[PDB]
Design an enzyme around this catalytic site. Structure first.
Site, PDB file in Angstrom:
ATOM      1  N   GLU A  98       0.864  -1.176   0.000  1.00  0.00           N
ATOM      2  CA  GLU A  98       0.000   0.000   0.000  1.00  0.00           C
ATOM      3  C   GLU A  98       0.901   1.226   0.000  1.00  0.00           C
ATOM      4  O   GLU A  98       1.719   1.401   0.913  1.00  0.00           O
ATOM      5  CB  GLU A  98      -0.932   0.026   1.216  1.00  0.00           C
ATOM      6  CG  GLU A  98      -2.165   0.956   1.045  1.00  0.00           C
ATOM      7  CD  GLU A  98      -2.028   2.369   1.646  1.00  0.00           C
ATOM      8  OE1 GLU A  98      -2.099   2.531   2.891  1.00  0.00           O
ATOM      9  OE2 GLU A  98      -1.886   3.333   0.861  1.00  0.00           O
ATOM     10  N   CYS A 107      -2.051   8.693   4.007  1.00  0.00           N
ATOM     11  CA  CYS A 107      -1.925   8.312   2.606  1.00  0.00           C
ATOM     12  C   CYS A 107      -3.134   8.778   1.810  1.00  0.00           C
ATOM     13  O   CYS A 107      -3.015   9.065   0.620  1.00  0.00           O
ATOM     14  CB  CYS A 107      -1.750   6.798   2.479  1.00  0.00           C
ATOM     15  SG  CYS A 107      -0.194   6.199   3.171  1.00  0.00           S
TER      16      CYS A 107
END
Ligand SMILES: Cc1cc2nc3c(=O)[nH]c(=O)nc-3n(C[C@H](O)[C@H](O)[C@H](O)COP(=O)(O)OP(=O)(O)OC[C@H]3O[C@@H](n4cnc5c(N)ncnc54)[C@H](O)[C@@H]3O)c2cc1C
Ligand SMILES: O=C1CCc2cc(Cl)ccc21
Lengths: 1193, 112, 56
Positions: A774, A808
C-alpha cells in the site's frame, strides 16, 4: 519543557454538582431516562381528559382550514413541479421585474431556458421536499431537465408565470418573515395586533471563517437595533426579541477550543446582550448540536453573572427535550436564575438535529446517543420538562415552542387557570405555526400568547406531516405519549431499527468504542490516564522467538518537542533479523496447526486488550507519533476493528486446505504506527503465518506495545517477533530465504525496491512471493458549483491537514469549478488560519508536527519551490513554541495545471486548481494521468456529475459529499490501484486470501454477471476445436466475481458500496497455446484487456478472433512501452517464472500483482490463476445526509 | 410491445416513445432521461475540443446529456410481476453526412 | 381490453407531453392486421389521431 498533558483539557470552571448531573446524563441508557420522565409528566385523569378534548378541538380547527394547486392546475408530475420551482428560483435571481418578464416571454417560454440561466437544479432537493415531502441528498438533474423541457413545451408561459409567483411568495413571505429585518418588522405588525410576539432569526450559523463570524455579528447587531427601535419600550414579553446561534459568532465554537470560545466568542455575545439590554428586548441563545450544550452553559453562566448585564431579564436559552440531559440542564438553569436574580427566558423545544446526532454517535463509537431514539420519548421528555418549568415561573420564563397540538394541550392544562402575560408563553415557527396558534392567542381562544420565530434573510413522525395525512385520525393525534409509554413492555426501550454504535455491524463483529472528548468526566479521566502514560518508561526491543535481543539503543523523541523523551528503542542487528526469519520458519508448522478459530480468538482477545488500554495507548501515540487525541482514538479504534474484522473473516473462511504461506515480513509506516502495524500483522497471523514485525524507525514504542498486547492475547513469541530498526532491518527481512510473503505500507519507491528483491526468489512451490504494498496517492477532490461551500471547506480542511497531511488518503489536489473557485478559496484560506498547530498533548491542537526534521525539510523545499515559481502560497503563522519540534504550517498552493505537481508531498500542503465546467472530463483524465489511484472526493449535488465522474475516475476509495480520510475497516475497505498499491484492500474481504497458498471464497464474493467478451472467446475456442479450454473459459466466466456490487453496513446517513471491477490491461506471458488460452480466459472473465508477450511466438494461436475479443487483445514486444498494466499472468517453469518476474519488476509505473503457473499446473488446477487478483476492488462512501437531513431516518 | 431487426422499426406500441414518432417535433416522454453519459461520446467531445470545433464539442456534450441511453425503469403493474423498461444502444447507425460539421453532429448523436 | 388500454394510454401520454410545438405529420395511413383486428387497429389509429393527425 511543559509537563506532558498537564494542560490537556482543563474545564472552563470546576464542575458544580448541578453541572456534573448534566454530564452524567449525557448518554444515559434510554430505559433509565424514561421512567422519571413518565413520572414527572403524569397528570390526573381529569386533566388528561381535558387536554385530549382541547387537542381534539385544536386539530378539528386545523383540519377544517399552494404548490399542490399549481401541480393540479397544470397536471404537473412531481419532477415537473420541482423543476418548475427551480426555474422560478433562478428567474427570481433576476432583480429587474421587466427584465425577468421579458426573459420569460421571449426566451424561457420558447424552450430556451438553459442558455439564459451553475445548474438550475442545485437546490432541487429543497424543492423536492416542498413538492413531494421527500428528501434526497442528491438531485437527478437529467430527470429535472427533461421535466422542465416537457412542462414548458406543454404549458408555456402561463405555468412559468404561476411558478414564479408561487416561488416569490414562498421564498419571500413563507420561508422567511422578510428578506431584511426592516421588511420582517413591517410584516410583523399584523399578527402583533392579534396578540402574537416575534423572535427574529437572522439566518446565520456555522461560521467557517473569522470574516463570516464578523458578518453574522454585524447582522445580529444591526438587527438588535432595528428590533429595539421597533420594540419602542414594549419590553421583553410583549415586544419582539432576537435569536442567535453561538456557532454563527465564532468559527471554532467547540469544547476543544473552549479557551478561544470563552476569550473571543463570549465578549461578542456580551456585546450583543448589552445592546439588547439597552432596548429591553429578548435575546435568545438557540440550541445546536449535543456536543455544544454544556459549553453553551458556561457562556450562559458568565453572562447571567456579569453585572454589566444586570437589570435586564431578556436573556434567553433553548433546551432540547429530545436530549437526555434536558431536565438536568433545566435544574442548572433554574438554579442559575435564582443565583443571578435574572429571570432567564427558557425556550423548551424538542430538537432540530436528530438525524445528525444519531449519525455522529454511530461514527464516533460512543456508548449511546445523547438524544432519544423514539419520537414518543421526546414527547414525554418535553411534557416532563414543561412540568419542571411550570413549577419555576417565579424565577424563569418558560417558552413552549411546539406545533404539536397534543403537546400544547397537555401543557395548557398543566399550567392551570392562573395566567398573566409574562408567566409563560408558547412559541411557533413563522409560516408553519400560525394556523394552530390562531386557535390559541386571544381572549376568544385559549388566551395564551405565542411568540413567532421569524427567519430573516435572502418526517412521517412529525405532527405537521401527520395533521395533513388523511389516514391519521384525530384519536391517533391526541394519544397521550405519557400513557402510551407507560404501557409499553419495556419503558424507554431504544428504537428497534436504530443500532447502538457498538452494534453497528450486528452479529458480524463488535464495533470498536471511542471516547467522547466533549464529556467532562471523560476529559478529566483521560487527562489522568494520558499524564500517567507519559510517566511510563516505554521501550521497544528486538523480541525474537528466543527472547529479547541485545542491540544499539537510542531514545525516541516527541516530534512536537524533541525535549520530550518518550522512550527507548533497541534496534535489531542485521544478523538477528536473519535469525528471526529462521526462527519463524522453524515455528511455522506449530502456528499453522493452531485451528483458525483459535487464532481468531487471539485476535479478538487482543482487541479487548487494546480497547481496555485505549487511554494509555492514546497517550503513547500522541507523544511518539505527534498525533492529536482525536486521531489517536481513531487509530486505536482502527487497530481494534482490524483485529475483530480479520478474526471474523477467518471464522467465515479459513479451513485446512487454505495453507499458510510461511513467515511473513510486515513492514509498517510511522503515520499509522498502531493501526496499520496491527492490521498487517493480525491478518498474516490469523491466516496461519508467523510474522516478523518491522515497525517504522520513527515509531517503535507503540509497535512494541502492540506486540506485547498480541502476545498477551495468546500469540506465541515464535509466531510474532518484533524487529525494530531502520531500512537495513527491513531489507534483511525481505531478502531472507525463508521469507514467504511481504506486507508493506510506505513509499512507492521503497515498495519498488522490495518488489525488485522479491523478484529474485520463488516460494517452495515455485510461485512468486506475494507482496501486498500500500503506497502513496496524489489524491484529488473535485468540487462543482452545486456544492455547499461550507461543507466543502470543512471537508477540505480536514482531508488536507488532519494529521498534518500525513495520511496516505490526505487531500493533495483540490479542483474547484471556476465559477465558485474564488469564494471557496477565500473561505478555505479563512478556515486555514483558524487552525491551532502545536504539540499535541493539548485538546485545543488541531494539527501536530510532521514526523521528522527530514520530513519537514522535504515538505518545505517543495513549498519554497512553488513559491519561487510564482504560485500563490497561503500559510498559517506558527507560534514560537513550535521551534522545539518539527512543524510545517498548513499550506495552500494555487497551481496553474495539475501537471505543476510532480511528486507526492507528504505533509499539510493543499494544492488548488480551477477548471471550467466543460473541461470536467479532461480534468478526470488529468487526475487519472498521475498514475495514482488511492482516494478521490467529489462534492456535487448533481446525479449526472456523480455518475460521470465516478464512472471515469480510477481510484480505490471514492467519497461523495464528505471528506476523503479515515476509511473504516469493513465499511470503506481501503486500498488503491496503479502507483497506490497492489491490493487487495486492507479491511476488506479479499485480504486474508492473499496470505494463504490457496485462497478461500470470501463471504458474499460472487457475481451473476458474465463478461460478454469472455463468452465470445469461449465460443471462439470451441470453433477452433479447443474444447477443454472453452470449458475452462466458461468456468472462469462463472467463477469471476466481476460485477459484484454490495452495500456494506455502516452508520445511518451514509451509503457504503463495495464493487469489483476490471483491473485494466493484464500482461500475459504464456509459454504454450493452451496456457495462453487459459490466461486469456482468466483475464477476460474478470473484464480485463490483455497485452500478450509477442516473444511467446503464439500469435498464430489467435487467428480469426471475434472483433469483441480482438478489441481487448494487444501484442507487446516492448512491455515497458505498452503499459501501464494492472497485473500479469505468467506460464513457465521455475527459471522462466523467475526471469519473467524480474522483467516485470523492471517495468516502470505500478507494482504489478503477478501470478505464475507451470504448464502442468494449468492443466491440473482450475485455480492455477486465481481470479481474486484479476479484479479491482472499489469502495465508495456517499454522505446521504449531505442535503441537510436523512431521508431513511 | 415491439422488437428490433426483422421484427420492426419501433418505437414500441403502448410505450412512451410512440406518440413522438407521429409529430414533426417529438416531445420529451414522461420519465425519459438518464444520468449515464456514453464514455465514447465524452472522448469524442474532448477530441472535438482539442480540434477547436467548439460548436460541435458543445453539441456533442449536449447530446450526451439529452440521451436517455441507460434509462432503467420499473413500470407499474400487477403484484407478483416485475415489469422493466430499459433503453439500450440500437447497434450500428448508418451515417450519410454531406459536410464535416454534419458528420460531427451525426457522430455525436449516434455515440451519445 | 387492449383496445381500451391503448386509447387510455395514448390519451394520458398526450396529456403528459403534447403542446403546440409538437406539430402533426398530416394524414396517416393506418394498416392493421386480421389477428388483432380491434386492438392493433385501435392502437395505431388512436395514437395517430391523438397526436393531431387525421387517419385513413
Ligand atoms: C419557535 C421555535 C424555536 C426553536 N428553536 C430550536 C433550537 O434553538 N434548537 C433546536 O434544536 N430546535 C429548535 N426548535 C425545534 C425544532 O426546530 C422542531 O421544530 C421541533 O423539534 C418540532 O417539534 P414539535 O413539538 O413541533 O413537533 P413534533 O412532530 O411533535 O415533534 C417532532 C420532533 O420530535 C423529535 N423526534 C422525531 N423523531 C424522533 C425519534 N425517532 N426519536 C426521538 N425524537 C424524535 C425531533 O425533535 C422532532 O423535531 C424550535 C422550534 C420552534 C417552534
Ligand atoms: O524499510 C525500508 C526502507 C528501505 C527498504 C528497502 C527494502 Cl528492500 C526493504 C525495506 C526497506
Amino acid at each position: 519543557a511543559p509537563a506532558p498533558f498537564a494542560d490537556f483539557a482543563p474545564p472552563v470552571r470546576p464542575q458544580s454538582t448541578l453541572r456534573r448531573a448534566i454530564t452524567a446524563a449525557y448518554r444515559r441508557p434510554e430505559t433509565e431516562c424514561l421512567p422519571p420522565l413518565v413520572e414527572a409528566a403524569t397528570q390526573s385523569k381529569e386533566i388528561r381528559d381535558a387536554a385530549a378534548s382541547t387537542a381534539r378541538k385544536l386539530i378539528e380547527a386545523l383540519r377544517g382550514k399552494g404548490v399542490e394547486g399549481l401541480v393540479q392546475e397544470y397536471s404537473l408530475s412531481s419532477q415537473e413541479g420541482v423543476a418548475l420551482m427551480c426555474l422560478a428560483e433562478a428567474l427570481l435571481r433576476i432583480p429587474d421585474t421587466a427584465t425577468r418578464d421579458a426573459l420569460i416571454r421571449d426566451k424561457i417560454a420558447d424552450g430556451n431556458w438553459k442558455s439564459h440561466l451553475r445548474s438550475l437544479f442545485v437546490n432541487a432537493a429543497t424543492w423536492g421536499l416542498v413538492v413531494t415531502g421527500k428528501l434526497t441528498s442528491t438531485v437527478n438533474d437529467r430527470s429535472l431537465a427533461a421535466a422542465l423541457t416537457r412542462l414548458i413545451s406543454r404549458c408555456g408561459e402561463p405555468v412559468i408565470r404561476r411558478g414564479v409567483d408561487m416561488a416569490m411568495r414562498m421564498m419571500g413571505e413563507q420561508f422567511v418573515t422578510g428578506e431584511t429585518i426592516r421588511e420582517a418588522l413591517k410584516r410583523s405588525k399584523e399578527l402583533e395586533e392579534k396578540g402574537f410576539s416575534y423572535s427574529y432569526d437572522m439566518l446565520g450559523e456555522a461560521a467557517t471563517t473569522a470574516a463570516d463570524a464578523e458578518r453574522y455579528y454585524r447582522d445580529y447587531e444591526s438587527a438588535i437595533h432595528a428590533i429595539g427601535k421597533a420594540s419602542a419600550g414594549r419590553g421583553i414579553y410583549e415586544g419582539p426579541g432576537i435569536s442567535i446561534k453561538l456557532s454563527a459568532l465564532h468559527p471554532r465554537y467547540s469544547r476543544a477550543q473552549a479557551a478561544r470560545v470563552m476569550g473571543e466568542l463570549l465578549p461578542r455575545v456580551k456585546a450583543l446582550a448589552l445592546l439588547a439590554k439597552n432596548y429591553d428586548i429578548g435575546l435568545n441563545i438557540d440550541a445546536e448540536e449535543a456536543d455544544r450544550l454544556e459549553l453553551s452553559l458556561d457562556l450562559l453562566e458568565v453572562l447571567c453573572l456579569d453585572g454589566d448585564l444586570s437589570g435586564w431579564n431578556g436573556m434567553g436559552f433553548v433546551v432540547q427535550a429530545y436530549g437526555k440531559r434536558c431536565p438536568f440542564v433545566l435544574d442548572f438553569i433554574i438554579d442559575l436564575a435564582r443565583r443571578s436574580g435574572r429571570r432567564i427566558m427558557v425556550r423548551l423545544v424538542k430538537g432540530a438535529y436528530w438525524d445528525a446526532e444519531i449519525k455522529r454517535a454511530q461514527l464516533d463509537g460512543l456508548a449511546d446517543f445523547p438524544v432519544f431514539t423514539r419520537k414518543i420519548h421526546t414527547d414525554v421528555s418535553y411534557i416532563a420538562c414543561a412540568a419542571k418549568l411550570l413549577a419555576a415561573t417565579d424565577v424563569v420564563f418558560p417558552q413552549f415552542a411546539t406545533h404539536n397540538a397534543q403537546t400544547l394541550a397537555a401543557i395548557y392544562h398543566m399550567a392551570g387557570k392562573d395566567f398573566h402575560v409574562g408567566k409563560y408563553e408558547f412559541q411557533c415557527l413563522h409560516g408553519m405555526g400560525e394556523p394552530l396558534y390562531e386557535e390559541v392567542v386571544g381572549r376568544g381562544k385559549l388566551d395564551r400568547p405565542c411568540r413567532i420565530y421569524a427567519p430573516v434573510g435572502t418526517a412521517n413522525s412529525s405532527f405537521v406531516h401527520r395533521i395533513n395525512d388523511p389516514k391519521v385520525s384525530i384519536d391517533e393525534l391526541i394519544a397521550d405519549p405519557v400513557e402510551v409509554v407507560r404501557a409499553m413492555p419495556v419503558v424507554g426501550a431504544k428504537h428497534d431499527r436504530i443500532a447502538l454504535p457498538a452494534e453497528l455491524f450486528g452479529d458480524a463483529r463488535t464495533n470498536s468504542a471511542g471516547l467522547d472528548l466533549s464529556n467532562e468526566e471523560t476529559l478529566a479521566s483521560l487527562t489522568e490516564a494520558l499524564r500517567e502514560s507519559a510517566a511510563m518508561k516505554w521501550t521497544a526491543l528486538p523480541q525474537l522467538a528466543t527472547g529479547p535481543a541485545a542491540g544499539e539503543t537510542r531514545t525516541v523523541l516527541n516530534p512536537g518537542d524533541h525535549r520530550d523523551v518518550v522512550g527507548s528503542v533497541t534496534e535489531t542487528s542485521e544478523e538477528d533479523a536473519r535469525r528471526a526469519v529462521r526462527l519463524a520458519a522453524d515455528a511455522a508448522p506449530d502456528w499453522a496447526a493452531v485451528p483458525p478459530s483459535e487464532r481468531a480468538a487471539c485476535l479478538d482477545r487482543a482487541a479487548e486488550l487494546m480497547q481496555a488500554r485505549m487511554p494509555t495507548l492514546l497517550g503513547l501515540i500522541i507523544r511518539e507519533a505527534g498525533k492529536s487525541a482525536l486521531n489517536a482514538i481513531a487509530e486505536v479504534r482502527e487497530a481494534i476493528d482490524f483485529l475483530r474484522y480479520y478474526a471474523e473473516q477467518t471464522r467465515r473462511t479459513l479451513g485446512p486446505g487454505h495453507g499458510p504461506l510461511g513467515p511473513i515480513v510486515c513492514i509498517s509506516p510511522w503515520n499509522f504506527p498502531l493501526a496499520i502495524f496491527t492490521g498487517q500483522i493480525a491478518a498474516a497471523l490469523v491466516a496461519g503465518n508467523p510474522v516478523l514485525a518491522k515497525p517504522a524507525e520513527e515509531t517503535p514504542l507503540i509497535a512494541a506495545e502492540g506486540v506485547r498486547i498480541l502476545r498477551e492475547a495468546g500469540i506465541p513469541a515464535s509466531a510474532l517477533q518484533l524487529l525494530p530498526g531502520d531500512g537495513r532491518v527491513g531489507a534483511a527481512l525481505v531478502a531472507a530465504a525463508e521469507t514467504a510473503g511481504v506486507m508493506f505500507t510506505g513509499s512507492t519507491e521503497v515498495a519498488r525496491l522490495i518488489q525488485a528483491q522479491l523478484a529474485d526468489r520463488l516460494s517452495p512451490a515455485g510461485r512468486p512471493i506475494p507482496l501486498i504494498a500500500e503506497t502513496g496517492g496524489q489524491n484529488a477532490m473535485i468540487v462543482d458549483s452545486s456544492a455547499l461551500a461550507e461543507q466543502v471547506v470543512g471537508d477540505v480542511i480536514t482531508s488536507a491537514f488532519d494529521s498534518a497531511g500525513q495520511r496516505c488518503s490526505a487531500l493533495r489536489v483540490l479542483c474547484l469549478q471556476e465559477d465558485v473557485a474564488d469564494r471557496i478559496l477565500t473561505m478555505l484560506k479563512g478556515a486555514l488560519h483558524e487552525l491551532h498547530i502545536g504539540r499535541t498533548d493539548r485538546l485545543s491542537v488541531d494539527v501536530g508536527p510532521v514526523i521528522t526534521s527530514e520530513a519537514k525539510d522535504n515538505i518545505e523545499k517543495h513549498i519554497e519551490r512553488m513559491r519561487g515559481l510564482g504560485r500563490k502560497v497561503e500559510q498559517i503563522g506558527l507560534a514560537s513554541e513550535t521551534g522545539v519540534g518539527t512543524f510545517v504550517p498548513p499550506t495552500i498552493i494555487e497551481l496553474e495545471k495539475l501537471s505543476d505537481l510532480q511528486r507526492e508531498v507528504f505533509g499539510p500542503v493543499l494544492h488548488v486548481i480551477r477548471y471550467r465546467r466543460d473541461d470536467l472530463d479532461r480534468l478526470v483524465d488529468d487526475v487519472n494521468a498521475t498514475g495514482y489511484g488511492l482516494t478521490f472526493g467529489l462534492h456535487t449535488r448533481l446525479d449526472e456529475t456523480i455518475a460521470h465522474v465516478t464512472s471515469r475516475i480510477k481510484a480505490g476509495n471514492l467519497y461523495i459529499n464528505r471528506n476523503i480520510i479515515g476509511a473504516v475497516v469493513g465499511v470503506q475497505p481501503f486500498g488503491g490501484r496503479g502507483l497506490s498499491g497492489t491490493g487487495p484492500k486492507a479491511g476488506g474481504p479479499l485480504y486474508l486470501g492473499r496470505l494463504v497458498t490457496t485462497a478461500p471464497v470470501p463471504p458474499q464474493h460472487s457475481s451473476v454477471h458474465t463478461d460478454p467478451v469472455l463468452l465470445d472467446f469461449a465460443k471462439w475456442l470451441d470453433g477452433k476445436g479447443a474444447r477443454a479450454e472453452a470449458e475452462a473459459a466458461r468456468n472462469a466466466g462463472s467463477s469471476s466475481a466481476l460485477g459484484l456490487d454490495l452495500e456494506l453496513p455502516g452508520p445511518v446517513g451514509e451509503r457504503n458500496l463495495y464493487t469489483l471491477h476490471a483491473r485494466g490491461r493484464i500482461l500475459l506471458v504464456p509459454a504454450t497455446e493452451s496456457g495462453l488460452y487459459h490466461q486469456l480466459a482468466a483475464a477476460l472473465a474478470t473484464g480485463n484487456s490483455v497485452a500478450i508477450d509477442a516473444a511467446s511466438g503464439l500469435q498464430a494461436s489467435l487467428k480469426n478472433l471475434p472483433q469483441t475479443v480482438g478489441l481487448r487483445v494487444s501484442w507487446s514486444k516492448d512491455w515497458a512501452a505498452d503499459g501501464p498494466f494492472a497485473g500479469a499472468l505468467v506460464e513457465g517453469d521455475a527459471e522462466r517464472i523467475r526471469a519473467v518476474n524480474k522483467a516485470i519488476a523492471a517495468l516502470p509505473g505500478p507494482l504489478l500483482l503477478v501470478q505464475a503457473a507451470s504448464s502442468g499446473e494449468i492443466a491440473r488446477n482450475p485455480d492455477a490463476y486465481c481470479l481474486n487478483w484479476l479484479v479491482e476492488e472499489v469502495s465508495a462512501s456517499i454522505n446521504t445526509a449531505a442535503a441537510g437531513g436523512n431521508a431513511s431516518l
